Amino acid sequence: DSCIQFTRHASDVLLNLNRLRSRDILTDVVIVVSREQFRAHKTVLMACSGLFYSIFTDQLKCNLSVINLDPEINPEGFCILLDFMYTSRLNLREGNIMAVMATAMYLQMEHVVDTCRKFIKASE
Amino acid sequence: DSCIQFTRHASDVLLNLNRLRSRDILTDVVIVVSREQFRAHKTVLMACSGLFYSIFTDQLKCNLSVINLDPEINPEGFCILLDFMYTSRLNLREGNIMAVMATAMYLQMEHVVDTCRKFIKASE
């Protein structure tokens, strides 16, 4: 086509979606990771994770307001990944990289799994 | 912080939100612009438009599944802006620029209003 494109649009949209999350505006699901609860927007989770895409495209699960993750999932790892979904920034540290990578494999977030593998390989 | 950032994340999120819109997945509002109907995600509309942000933060309007726009709004202008919200690309043409600018002023999409003003000024 003959369209023009606003370079910062996608980043500005994501920043606003994170502001809605902060302010608990139109959040429509609670993700439970053992004793912790995380509120989020189903559409953002589906856009970022192959696991959430499969969950919320299921005719029965799409209607659930609470999703319980596998008890082996670390809440801090999930929190770091949820922040990445809404900001593009990943708080990867020596002390959390194994939990983050395991969580990203479970959530099916291939780009995160890729950078974790690379950072682990560099330390070996 | 000491975060790393995935450059293409925001663009990939927006591309996936547009794929959900295409496939009518988790759309939760119908915007009526005279005889036409447009299905969308309330969160994407709020992230892009000052008018939708004000509508869906209102304690009564946040619960509506149908929103009727002012009868003076042109459906093609709205369609072009809805596509911009989900893609960052604006299909601006000599034949639609006045309707697009009027619609962007009503929707409170300041960056679009800015480029329309500039393209109009260049033709004068």
């Binding site: 369209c3 023009i4 494109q5 606003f6 370079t7 | 604006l90």
Partner: peptide
């Protein structure tokens, strides 16, 4: 704004 750019030409994509």
């Amino acid at each position: 704004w750019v030409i994509p």
